[PDB]
Amino acid sequence: VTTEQQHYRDLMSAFPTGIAVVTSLDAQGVPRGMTCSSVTSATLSPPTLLVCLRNGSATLDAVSATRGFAVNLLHDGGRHAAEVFSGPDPNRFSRVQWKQCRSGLPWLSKDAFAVAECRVSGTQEVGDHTVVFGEVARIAQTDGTPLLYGLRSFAAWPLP
Amino acid sequence: GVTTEQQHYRDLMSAFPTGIAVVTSLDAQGVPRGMTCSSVTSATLSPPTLLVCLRNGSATLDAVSATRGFAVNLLHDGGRHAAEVFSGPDPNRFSRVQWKQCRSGLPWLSKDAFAVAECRVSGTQEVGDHTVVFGEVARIAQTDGTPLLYGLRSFAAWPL
Numbered sequence: 647v648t649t650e651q652q653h654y655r656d657l658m659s660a661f662p663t664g665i666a667v668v669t670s671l672d673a674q675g676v677p678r679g680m681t682c683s684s685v686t687s688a689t690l691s692p693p694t695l696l697v698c699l700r701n702g703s704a705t706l707d708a709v710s711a712t713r714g715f716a717v718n719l720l721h722d723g724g725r726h727a728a729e730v731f732s733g734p735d736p737n738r739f740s741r742v743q744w745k746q747c748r749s750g751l752p753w754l755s756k757d758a759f760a761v762a763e764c765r766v767s768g769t770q771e772v773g774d775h776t777v778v779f780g781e782v783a784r785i786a787q788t789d790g791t792p793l794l795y796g797l798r799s800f801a802a803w804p805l806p
Numbered sequence: 807g808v809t810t811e812q813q814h815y816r817d818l819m820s821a822f823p824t825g826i827a828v829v830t831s832l833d834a835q836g837v838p839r840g841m842t843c844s845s846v847t848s849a850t851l852s853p854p855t856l857l858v859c860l861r862n863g864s865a866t867l868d869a870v871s872a873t874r875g876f877a878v879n880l881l882h883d884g885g886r887h888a889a890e891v892f893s894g895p896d897p898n899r900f901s902r903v904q905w906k907q908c909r910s911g912l913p914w915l916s917k918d919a920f921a922v923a924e925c926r927v928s929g930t931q932e933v934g935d936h937t938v939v940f941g942e943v944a945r946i947a948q949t950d951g952t953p954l955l956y957g958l959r960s961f962a963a964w965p966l
């Protein structure tokens with residue numbers, strides 16, 4: 647017995663999350679990234695998160711080529727960035743402010759309140775996606791109200 | 807206990823808010839087990855598969871591994887007490903919430919959850935002291951409700 651895809655979409659839509667832009671570099675050195683809601687903590691020993699990226703995506707290809715990626719947590723002013731990095735716009739990085747970290751990884755310096763640089767420590771394919779484990783290597787974090795996505799809409803963390 | 811490094815990582819991940827589920831199963835002797843879970847993540851639509859990340863040695867992970875199935879109970883904004891009890895030290899948590907047994911046997915938190923998804927374990931991946939559990943969704947029931955949220959070390963309600 648297996649549920650239908652629409653019922654599953656409706657279920658998962660009702661689990662709201664923060665919003666990241668996951669970034670890396672492709673083999674040509676070109677920044678790549680996507681809006682990502684699948685950031686999940688895996689373990690503290692060593693500090694490891696995971697993301698789940700669509701197979702064939704430019705971002706997964708860059709993550710695999712660089713074996714590292716940055717997780718840029720968006721604050722409430724970052725809705726436009728989240729739209730850019732989930733939509734059909736070309737040259738997404740020309741539409742946001744960004745800087746290259748010491749690692750070379752793209753950091754969204756205006757739209758994110760925190761950025762974690764991760765080394766790819768393993769992957770696991772599941773259907774048409776790949777779970778990517780990231781061992782966190784460097785963190786820069788400031789105060790900010792997190793952007794949220796849930797029930798097919800953007801919102802803001804409701805507490806000061 | 808945590809190291810300084812691990813604390814910086816907790817500070818980061820705390821700023822990625824999520825909905826809140828209670829993941830339930832039965833142990834080998836039929837006893838209901840469950841825990842508060844913020845690691846619910848969508849993996850793929852083909853077939854519909856989510857994942858959760860459960861601590862190794864937890865009663866819930868042992869039950870999930872025994873029975874190869876589990877329920878994901880998404881809590882609505884009246885469910886804070888259930889989330890607190892299912893994240894605390896008391897093994898008699900099931901006597902402190904109102905619940906019902908699904909036809910399959912899985913525990914359903916009927917008073918505190920607005921949705922329940924019954925899952926078959928389709929794979930696992932150990933990562934440090936945790937196990938990522940892949941759940942192929944077999945059945946979903948859902949009603950309207952405002953999702954409970956957790957972020958920045960606080961409960962809140964979805965604001966829209």
Ligand SMILES: Cc1cc2nc3c(=O)[nH]c(=O)nc-3n(C[C@H](O)[C@H](O)[C@H](O)COP(=O)(O)OP(=O)(O)OC[C@H]3O[C@@H](n4cnc5c(N)ncnc54)[C@H](O)[C@@H]3O)c2cc1C
Binds near residue numbers: 702737
């Ligand atoms: C709130 C939210 C959360 C999301 N979370 C996740 C998640 O956790 N995991 C995940 O895998 N995806 C997620 N997505 C979807 C993801 O952000 C988009 O699919 C994104 O476009 C992928 O970017 P990419 O460059 O890696 O992929 P590609 O599909 O390889 O796109 C490459 C480039 O082509 C352009 N492009 C974008 N979309 C299209 C299109 N439809 N047709 C043609 N060209 C296009 C853009 O310039 C893009 O950079 C999420 C989307 C939203 C809105």
Ligand SMILES: Cc1cc2nc3c(=O)[nH]c(=O)nc-3n(C[C@H](O)[C@H](O)[C@H](O)COP(=O)(O)OP(=O)(O)OC[C@H]3O[C@@H](n4cnc5c(N)ncnc54)[C@H](O)[C@@H]3O)c2cc1C
Binds near residue numbers: 863893
């Ligand atoms: C907001 C929030 C989100 C969380 N998200 C996650 C998550 O995504 N993943 C995760 O792994 N944890 C998560 N936790 C932690 C998790 O909810 C707690 O660790 C929870 O108490 C685990 O329950 P358990 O019964 O499976 O674990 P256990 O630690 O096995 O048991 C809890 C208590 O019951 C006792 N006990 C266990 N089994 C038995 C038995 N057979 N007989 C007698 N006593 C027994 C234990 O000694 C302990 O005192 C989260 C906590 C919070 C607050």
Ligand SMILES: NC(=O)C1=CN([C@@H]2O[C@H](COP(=O)(O)OP(=O)(O)OC[C@H]3O[C@@H](n4cnc5c(N)ncnc54)[C@H](O)[C@@H]3O)[C@@H](O)[C@H]2O)C=CC1
Binds near residue numbers: 799849
């Ligand atoms: N690839 C992914 O993991 C995700 C992709 N998206 C995509 O973003 C767009 C908008 O999403 P919503 O506004 O939430 O409406 P929606 O109704 O399409 O999706 C609801 C929820 O279902 C899950 N989901 C949807 N498509 C998925 C996919 N292809 N793979 C895995 N899980 C998926 C996610 O939890 C998503 O938030 C859609 O194109 C959706 O596919 C959104 C979230 C996760």
Ligand SMILES: NC(=O)C1=CN([C@@H]2O[C@H](COP(=O)(O)OP(=O)(O)OC[C@H]3O[C@@H](n4cnc5c(N)ncnc54)[C@H](O)[C@@H]3O)[C@@H](O)[C@H]2O)C=CC1
Binds near residue numbers: 690
């Ligand atoms: N085991 C898990 O995956 C999780 C466990 N918890 C438990 O609840 C407690 C309180 O959490 P918060 O109030 O958010 O404050 P916190 O500062 O203790 O934790 C902040 C965040 O760090 C991550 N994290 C913490 N402990 C973790 C662990 N053992 N494994 C993986 N990721 C972990 C989670 O994303 C958590 O929300 C944590 O200290 C922990 O015991 C909470 C979230 C997930």
